[PDB]
Amino acid sequence: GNKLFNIAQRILDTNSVLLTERGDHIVWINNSWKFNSEEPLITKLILSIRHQLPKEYSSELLCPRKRKTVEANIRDMLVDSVETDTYPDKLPFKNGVLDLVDGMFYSGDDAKKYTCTVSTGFKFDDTKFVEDSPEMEELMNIINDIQPLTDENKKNRELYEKTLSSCLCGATKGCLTFFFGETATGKSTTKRLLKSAIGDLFVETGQTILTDVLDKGPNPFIANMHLKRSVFCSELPDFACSGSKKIRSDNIKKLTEPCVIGRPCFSNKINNRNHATIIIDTNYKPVFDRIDNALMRRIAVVRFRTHFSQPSGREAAENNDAYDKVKLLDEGLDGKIQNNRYRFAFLYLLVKWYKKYHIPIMKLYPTPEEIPDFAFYLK
Amino acid sequence: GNKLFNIAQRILDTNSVLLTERGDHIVWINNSWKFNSEEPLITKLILSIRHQLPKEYSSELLCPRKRKTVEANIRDMLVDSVETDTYPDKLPFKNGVLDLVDGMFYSGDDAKKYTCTVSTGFKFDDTKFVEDSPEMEELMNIINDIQPLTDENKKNRELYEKTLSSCLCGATKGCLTFFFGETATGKSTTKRLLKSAIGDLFVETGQTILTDVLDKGPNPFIANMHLKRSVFCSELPDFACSGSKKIRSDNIKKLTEPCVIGRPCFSNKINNRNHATIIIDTNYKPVFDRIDNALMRRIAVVRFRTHFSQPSGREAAENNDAYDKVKLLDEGLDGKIQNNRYRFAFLYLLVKWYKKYHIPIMKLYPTPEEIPDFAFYLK
Amino acid sequence: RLEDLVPDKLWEPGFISFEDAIKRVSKIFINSIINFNDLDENNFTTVPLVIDYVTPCALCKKRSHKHPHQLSLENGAIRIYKTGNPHSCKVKIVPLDGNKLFNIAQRILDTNSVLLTERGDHIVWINNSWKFNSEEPLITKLILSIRHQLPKEYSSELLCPRKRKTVEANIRDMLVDSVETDTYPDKLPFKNGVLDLVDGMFYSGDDAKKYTCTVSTGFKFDDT
Amino acid sequence: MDAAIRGNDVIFVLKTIGVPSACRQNEDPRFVEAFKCDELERYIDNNPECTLFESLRDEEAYSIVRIFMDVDLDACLDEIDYLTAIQDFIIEVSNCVARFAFTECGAIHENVIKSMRSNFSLTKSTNRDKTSFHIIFLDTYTTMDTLIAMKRTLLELSRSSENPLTRSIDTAVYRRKTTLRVVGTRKNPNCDTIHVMQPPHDNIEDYLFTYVDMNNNSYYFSLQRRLEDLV
DNA sequence: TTTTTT
Ligand SMILES: Nc1ncnc2c1ncn2[C@@H]1O[C@H](COP(=O)(O)OP(=O)(O)OP(=O)(O)O)[C@@H](O)[C@H]1O
Ligand SMILES: Nc1ncnc2c1ncn2[C@@H]1O[C@H](COP(=O)(O)OP(=O)(O)OP(=O)(O)O)[C@@H](O)[C@H]1O
Ligand SMILES: Nc1ncnc2c1ncn2[C@@H]1O[C@H](COP(=O)(O)OP(=O)(O)O)[C@@H](O)[C@H]1O
Ligand SMILES: [Mg+2]
């Protein structure tokens, strides 16, 4: 009978438009599950798909009135809600989703059944995903410089690799990792490398989430953690000073749960999904308000024992007791890092590490025997 | 006269559209009452029910403007408001409502007179609702591991079963439950099992609803308890340190009435129906500011005394005092709980407990003989 | 079979109904066709049309014609030509594909004056400056300004405001891939061109357009 | 990007339509030959009746060809309207190719526009009943695979215009191992219609689309993706 | 901060 109704049926049954639990509509164009609350992209999808119809149906997809009618007819057919971001082992790029079970990369209709909302923000280029390359060699040299693979530093090396590789899967982490080390050691180097590797799925905020309550008033730092896969906590102030804020334990217990409670400004939605790995960049021994067995199983610490400096204070660096090896500082590193010269190389290294470690299941383990404050309670 | 007016009359005759007290227009589609405020669902219902009309009337119901005219005619006939959620012994699903007095599961027209607004969000699968299944065996093993059925833990087990089963009926309760236990004892596992069991009728709000005034200004945490049948307040902070506000007895005494007071942001509605079974996940003994007879009769507490550990801390847990039994920790349990493996088995266990305990009437009784602060008052 | 012979027919699906197609032809001949009843979907390319000349012919502006006209179908358009001496009457073509305003939107987007920036705005190109705005879109202004660089048969439709709104709506539905801006960092954008820095030459007009400079100093460059 | 790819001064021509593939690979003098610009003129002068069909010698070795189009309108057009028709034809064509070169080829839009409207070579048929020509853009270089991909958008443009010249665009020539008749030769020994040059271009070097000479004003663009991912 | 906006 009707003609535009069949067009709407064809748009619907191909499973291109979906309805989310919050009441928004997600569409599928440019090989990405993009959505806009203010600009409906349904008309764009209709005009883009007009090419896959019989010649007698295309002519009706030119009048803006007819496209609006088709959109209105489509909107009255989505009755059941659909939940998104259910697959925890898929890394979504702008032009497709890269699988992690076998390393293959899908695109188009293949990378569509996995309803991925967030994305890294940049396209995926398979030609730079090779294993042998000068960028690979330079990055391997950098990684072996920051964490030497000696028998004295074997467990620390593999723990560092595991913590870095955990920042890909979208499951719920259950431990907090401290990047505890001295100044000018290479913590920011790893932070920048990870930020270039994963891009948009990486945020860094202040230390207030550790020394403040998370319920009174708004908390925009919590709403920024929705569906993020890695959170870095830098600029942690020293605590041996006067009246310095102490790391509240309750925040640590509340930051490792599948749902963190907190509302952004001018909003009411109080639930948030916690897919983020929390890494804390401190400088000295962290002190808490109270130590208990409930805090014993949510703490992991890695050690950085390689200082970088210019030949000015070379002897001072060589004589210091907190270091293990000192090398020459480089200036162009921060230049080519921001140009993403080690973008896909670090991504391939991370994928290899993830396939090596967490292929059966994902689980982070604590290590309580690395801080003397936690060695006191050995009684 | 007009043909579309007859369509509106026929749609009104089948009694699928109702006008609620708050001013919303609830519809009846896919065997479940649905509603929305920003985008009314009347046209969706019209298109869905198109098929149940005579031949000459169905073809008239495809043009969007004619559907809008039918909706406009419908909205001019709903003058009397109808109340909702009057049956407190029913568990509505996404494709019907499961009766609790005898275990039958109505659907379609039979499951329509029970005007239930909130729903679990998932469909009912009768194949997995059977008693005999390997999932049931695993769930029973886990439940017995968490709360062993010995004679020294008899009343505690009965209280645990009663409290967990009370989360199904949509009536008003009168006691608060404290899940007291040491570290890694099974509280969060029970919380996640219950959340997977009941689904949407389960929200988790912060601790702010207990120690802060809930009248001045907006408080969306109170506004999100509207018609929910279970509310969890996890991770109560300790009070042995200074700066932590005591638990306001006024707030507890104000959380056990059929209408709590609170408004969401940007709204003037100040009445919230209270069907919630409030359970507090604590780690330490609670402390209050005022104690009287009106408070000791509204507090109940169940104890978890089974510690799940790894072989590393076996001797530490064995010689502890807060534990009565040590068991091997499992890794896949936290993994496959989110996948909804023990959902229907736990639902069947809960309905069996409900029909065993609260079949004549539903009521909770306080047990003030466990808090030392109230033990002093037992003079 | 015909698939290997030619992928062509006399009336493929997608074309308008034959009665509508003739109606468009009938409006071009301002006078009345005499033998109209001899036409159908199977002989309109052979039957000569004997026009009655009361008013001068709408095609060649002559008083009358010696011979009848005759239709022909090529590439999805009924070309109208006159038999006898071919140079006496000019050539008119009757399109029958689809919407005209859609063609206008396609050909305006073709000249690369409307772009979708990364942030989500709609930059335009008027008065030699990549000006843009969010609250007040300037797409209609761009249409009215660029009506000059289009064929004659498109100017008559870019005057009524509702047609321009329709063209704007069509344009907004074709921009699906975004383009980044401000790639060259050593250029100074002015209100009437872009000034280079490596050699001091000051470009303007189309030449100073490939440098997609969103911002501008706000004043004009005075070479004097 | 060696020396041999920045130049191609060898011409591959045919001698009869419908040459079988076996004769083409064997490269027998009887049907196909190699030529230079000067030698081509001598051959045409010595054979005032011969027929030649310009085509590409090898596909995968050299795909670099100029931009060319074909027009065949079966109706005479008077001089003033012919001039007006050719102005709209170039404006629409130059824009359409530039848009495609910018959206799916990663090239700059304005460089393509300037390089096309500046220097173009036009032919003219000797027939009087119909108007046909071969417009070859002199300073726009690309691969043949680009023209094959461009075939779709060109066809859409030809069916969506009112100008008679641009509506009669021959979009079927764009295929694999195409053939373009050289100016100054017939189509068959029985035909009497040939193409003639037009001012100001006098050298025959301006009418062979296989002649590649990248000068200071030429532009190059091609696809980044290949013809197998474009399903 | 919210409300007010918009
Ligand atoms: N019946 C069971 N069989 C096997 N493993 C179990 C069982 N019950 C719990 N576990 C495991 O033992 C641990 C118990 O954690 P639990 O849910 O008690 O933590 P919690 O209440 O959040 O802790 P805390 O009070 O320290 O914050 C988890 O690792 C869980 O997977
Ligand atoms: N140039 C013409 N010469 C002769 N008859 C014509 C001409 N143009 C139109 N007609 C006649 O006019 C009729 C009009 O039919 P048409 O399809 O336009 O119907 P309509 O849109 O329903 O309106 P109406 O019949 O009232 O004009 C045609 O069927 C045809 O017989
Ligand atoms: N392996 C390395 N090779 C060369 N330079 C390095 C290496 N590791 C660190 N650097 C240099 O050290 C400088 C400071 O290190 P940084 O990452 O800031 O340490 P921290 O994070 O502890 O402050 C950086 O500018 C970087 O260029
Ligand atoms: Mg737990």
mmCIF file with all atom_site columns, C-alpha atoms in Angstrom, chain A residues 182 315-324:
data_model
loop_
_atom_site.group_PDB
_atom_site.id
_atom_site.type_symbol
_atom_site.label_atom_id
_atom_site.label_alt_id
_atom_site.label_comp_id
_atom_site.label_asym_id
_atom_site.label_entity_id
_atom_site.label_seq_id
_atom_site.pdbx_PDB_ins_code
_atom_site.Cartn_x
_atom_site.Cartn_y
_atom_site.Cartn_z
_atom_site.occupancy
_atom_site.B_iso_or_equiv
_atom_site.pdbx_formal_charge
_atom_site.auth_seq_id
_atom_site.auth_comp_id
_atom_site.auth_asym_id
_atom_site.auth_atom_id
_atom_site.pdbx_PDB_model_num
ATOM 1  C CA . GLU A 1 182 ? 61.507 10.079 42.564 1.00 0.00 ? 182 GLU A CA 1
ATOM 2  C CA . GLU A 1 315 ? 78.193 12.766 39.869 1.00 0.00 ? 315 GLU A CA 1
ATOM 3  C CA . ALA A 1 316 ? 75.328 13.728 42.190 1.00 0.00 ? 316 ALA A CA 1
ATOM 4  C CA . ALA A 1 317 ? 73.029 11.332 40.333 1.00 0.00 ? 317 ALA A CA 1
ATOM 5  C CA . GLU A 1 318 ? 75.713 8.619  40.358 1.00 0.00 ? 318 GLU A CA 1
ATOM 6  C CA . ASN A 1 319 ? 76.262 8.952  44.127 1.00 0.00 ? 319 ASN A CA 1
ATOM 7  C CA . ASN A 1 320 ? 72.596 9.105  45.172 1.00 0.00 ? 320 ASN A CA 1
ATOM 8  C CA . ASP A 1 321 ? 71.277 6.180  47.205 1.00 0.00 ? 321 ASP A CA 1
ATOM 9  C CA . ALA A 1 322 ? 67.725 6.072  45.807 1.00 0.00 ? 322 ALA A CA 1
ATOM 10 C CA . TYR A 1 323 ? 68.769 5.284  42.214 1.00 0.00 ? 323 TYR A CA 1
ATOM 11 C CA . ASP A 1 324 ? 70.141 2.194  40.498 1.00 0.00 ? 324 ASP A CA 1
#
